[PDB]
């Protein structure tokens with residue numbers, strides 16, 4: 072299919088997805104001495120309705136928390152954007168060890184995991200499928216997760232993993248507002264890039280928060296306890312699902328601050 076095996080992992084991906092070696096790939100290392108402070112960036116505005124929370128699904132290489140995306144009850148606006156963007160999902164990336172689970176790095180520093188909160192351009196497109204492949208189709212807030220004290224805001228999410236332990240398993244996941252997962256400062260870097268796994272479409276305007284959020288070593292352990300096999304097959308823990316940083320290929324990372 073594609074995955075994070077060594078058989079079918081990131082260094083493998085370009086065979087089926089040549090875009091893997093494109094000019095707008097993600098994640099990046101953000102070099103703070105190379106970032107241009109853009110004064111024209113507005114602040115990030117998020118407004119989510121907890122009722123749009125829908126389902127949690129074990130997707131084999133990760134798990135996704137999906138939201139009702141039929142209307143604009145939950146939206147991202149401001150920042151680099153003229154258009155309002157519509158929440159459809161959030162998910163995490165993590166690695167084998169606490170030393171490097173993040174996707175994005177800052178000045179070489181590798182964090183323990185990363186929260187992606189994903190939105191599509193409902194002003195221009197009529198759906199996620201249509202938006203997903205357009206340069207201006209998706210917005211994703213990335214939040215660096217730094218290992219330390221346990222994070223209480225994760226609780227609902229972690230509690231729900233026992234229901235969707237094996238690949239394909241899903242369950243309702245309702246009444247939750249994921250703006251409660253975001254750090255209390257909204258200062259951010261932006262850049263054009265891509266989905267961080269196949270199909271790797273260069274459709275994403277990234278909003279990387281400057282402030283990290285906490286996670287505990289044992290919270291991370293829950294993520295890696297999820298299984299990539301289907302019920303009944305031998306267990307194959309989801310050890311990691313983060314992709315190496317990619318060449319900027321000429322792009323400029325802008326700072327909101």
Ligand SMILES: N[C@@H](Cc1c[nH]c[nH+]1)C(=O)O
Pocket residue numbers: 162189199203266267268269
């Ligand atoms: N979780 C997917 C979201 C997606 C949008 N379109 C297709 N998939 C991603 O890696 O970026």
Ligand SMILES: [Zn+2]
Pocket residue numbers: 162163164187267
């Ligand atoms: Zn992601």
